[PDB]
Amino acid sequence: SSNAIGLIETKGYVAALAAADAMVKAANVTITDRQQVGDGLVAVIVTGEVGAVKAATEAGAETASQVGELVSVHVIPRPHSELGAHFSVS
Amino acid sequence: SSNAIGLIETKGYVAALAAADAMVKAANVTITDRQQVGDGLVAVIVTGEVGAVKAATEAGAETASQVGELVSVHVIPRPHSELGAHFSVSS
Amino acid sequence: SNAIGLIETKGYVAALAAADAMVKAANVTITDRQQVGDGLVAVIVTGEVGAVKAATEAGAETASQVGELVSVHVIPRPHSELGAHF
Amino acid sequence: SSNAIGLIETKGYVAALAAADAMVKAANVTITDRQQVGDGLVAVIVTGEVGAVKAATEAGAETASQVGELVSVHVIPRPHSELGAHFSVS
Amino acid sequence: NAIGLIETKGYVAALAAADAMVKAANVTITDRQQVGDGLVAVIVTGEVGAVKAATEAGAETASQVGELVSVHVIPRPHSELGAHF
Amino acid sequence: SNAIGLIETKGYVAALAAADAMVKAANVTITDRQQVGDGLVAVIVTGEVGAVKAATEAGAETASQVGELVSVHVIPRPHSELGAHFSVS
Numbered sequence: 129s130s131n132a133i134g135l136i137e138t139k140g141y142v143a144a145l146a147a148a149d150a151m152v153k154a155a156n157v158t159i160t161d162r163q164q165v166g167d168g169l170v171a172v173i174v175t176g177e178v179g180a181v182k183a184a185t186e187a188g189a190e191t192a193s194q195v196g197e198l199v200s201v202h203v204i205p206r207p208h209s210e211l212g213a214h215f216s217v218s
Numbered sequence: 219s220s221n222a223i224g225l226i227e228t229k230g231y232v233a234a235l236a237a238a239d240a241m242v243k244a245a246n247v248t249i250t251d252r253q254q255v256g257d258g259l260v261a262v263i264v265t266g267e268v269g270a271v272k273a274a275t276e277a278g279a280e281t282a283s284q285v286g287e288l289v290s291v292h293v294i295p296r297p298h299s300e301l302g303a304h305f306s307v308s309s
Numbered sequence: 310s311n312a313i314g315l316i317e318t319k320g321y322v323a324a325l326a327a328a329d330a331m332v333k334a335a336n337v338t339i340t341d342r343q344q345v346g347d348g349l350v351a352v353i354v355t356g357e358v359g360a361v362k363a364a365t366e367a368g369a370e371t372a373s374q375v376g377e378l379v380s381v382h383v384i385p386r387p388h389s390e391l392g393a394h395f
Numbered sequence: 396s397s398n399a400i401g402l403i404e405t406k407g408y409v410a411a412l413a414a415a416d417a418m419v420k421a422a423n424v425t426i427t428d429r430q431q432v433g434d435g436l437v438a439v440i441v442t443g444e445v446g447a448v449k450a451a452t453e454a455g456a457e458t459a460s461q462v463g464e465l466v467s468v469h470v471i472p473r474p475h476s477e478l479g480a481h482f483s484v485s
Numbered sequence: 486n487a488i489g490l491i492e493t494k495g496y497v498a499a500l501a502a503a504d505a506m507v508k509a510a511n512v513t514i515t516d517r518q519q520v521g522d523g524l525v526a527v528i529v530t531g532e533v534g535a536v537k538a539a540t541e542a543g544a545e546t547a548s549q550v551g552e553l554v555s556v557h558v559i560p561r562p563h564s565e566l567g568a569h570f
Numbered sequence: 571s572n573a574i575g576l577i578e579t580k581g582y583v584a585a586l587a588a589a590d591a592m593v594k595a596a597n598v599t600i601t602d603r604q605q606v607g608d609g610l611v612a613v614i615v616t617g618e619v620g621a622v623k624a625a626t627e628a629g630a631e632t633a634s635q636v637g638e639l640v641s642v643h644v645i646p647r648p649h650s651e652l653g654a655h656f657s658v659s
């Protein structure tokens with residue numbers, strides 16, 4: 129905080145975009161990355177204070193499940209200080 | 219304001235094309251993105267006025283269900299100001 | 310003469326086989342070829358409505374015999390936009 | 396004329412390469428195209444006289460079934476005159 | 486210069502696993518591979534013991550978060566790899 | 571030295587492990603890597619037929635251990651019409 133990251137992965141782009149907007153609506157988080165690794169998987173990564181990050185991912189997960197298919201939801205309170213040099217989480 | 223988002227996701231290009239065609243016919247909307255993320259999924263994104271986008275999306279979902287499988291249907295009336303930095307939702 | 314007919318398969322060979330069967334069966338023109346991943350290939354032909362229908366019927370038949378047919382559709386009057394994405 | 400087309404589609408690159416090798420060994424055919432449209436699918440396209448193309452595809456099909464999994468086998472005796480404009484079959 | 490490898494399906498499990506690996510020991514993320522079908526691979530390098538400790542933590546985290554596909558350690562990667570690998 | 575060794579696995583890790591085992595097993599050269607979807611990764615090696623056989627067998631076993639082996643194959647004497655559309659050299 130404010131370096132905590134929230135992670136949402138859906139099966140479908142529309143569920144992911146819906147979740148993304150729901151996440152930034154619900155808390156003061158910043159979208160820092162989007163990953164599409166195939167087989168329908170789309171991942172949206174947000175950063176901010178750990179409290180806001182959890183609020184974001186909770187709202188994002190609910191929206192993803194309603195719009196399409198939620199695959200994963202996760203929070204990393206303190207990412208490794210050098211993680212952001214290999215994965216976009218800043 | 220003319221930044222409402224309409225979202226359709228189907229299985230396969232043909233159902234998505236049919237859907238996209240139905241959306242632009244239905245109302246004053248603009249296709250702003252097309253995404254292909256695997257497992258047969260194809261997504262069509264449109265923008266325009268809220269009413270136009272709602273109408274286009276309804277037409278999109280109906281056509282999608284006829285040609286193939288409709289996976290997702292969604293509307294975002296008032297997108298977060300940061301959404302477009304990172305998703306293509308603008309004309 | 311601006312109607313389009315669409316054949317989508319899960320595999321290149323079934324798509325190519327369908328494409329040839331279509332132009333053989335009617336005086337249509339292959340105008341586009343789309344591959345959206347995971348084996349999906351779409352062939353788009355253009356012509357008069359009656360013949361794109363005959364073409365897609367022949368294409369669908371051949372696609373099913375050769376491989377896996379995913380979709381078959383005809384749009385008599387497609388829009389004049391769609392755009393750079395479609 | 397030597398413009399008949401022989402088509403083999405496999406799942407897995409190894410089955411396709413093995414099949415491709417069997418196809419040119421089996422007859423007087425020439426590898427014209429190679430396609431990989433996702434989901435493991437690999438296509439091999441050969442050209443030549445109809446009889447040779449027939450012999451090539453049967454050998455390719457057998458090898459593909461041995462090494463991996465055969466998806467499609469097809470022969471087009473006389474391809475449409477403008478087929479080779481949207482599809483590499485020369 | 487041993488390497489440790491973690492592969493998952495889904496980016497989320499992979500990012501969590503990578504984070505665990507660099508936290509666990511003296512390793513450095515030197516590569517990342519996404520070969521399709523949702524598969525995501527992360528590779529770290531360093532001394533053997535550290536690489537081993539990282540992958541254990543990496544595999545543990547990956548299984549908790551999502552689905553772990555493969556976990557492996559190569560104490561000394563061959564030089565004849567660095568052209569297509 | 572024209573023989574081809576072919577290994578196909580699920581996932582990058584099983585493939586890299588297999589590739590590593592192959593180049594350590596004999597005097598072969600990795601000439602290609604192919605990722606054609608559904609999790610499939612292929613590694614192709616070339617060299618003398620004996621070396622290719624030893625490499626291929628050692629790669630396949632490592633592949634079974636790390637992940638799943640899909641295909642294993644050896645082409646002792648590949649046709650010359652193959653190299654024009656397939657990286658085997």
Ligand SMILES: [Cl-]
Binds near residue numbers: 294295296297
């Ligand atoms: Cl909204």
Ligand SMILES: [Cl-]
Binds near residue numbers: 416417418454
């Ligand atoms: Cl043969």
Ligand code: NA
Binds near residue numbers: 242243247
């Ligand atoms: Na319109």
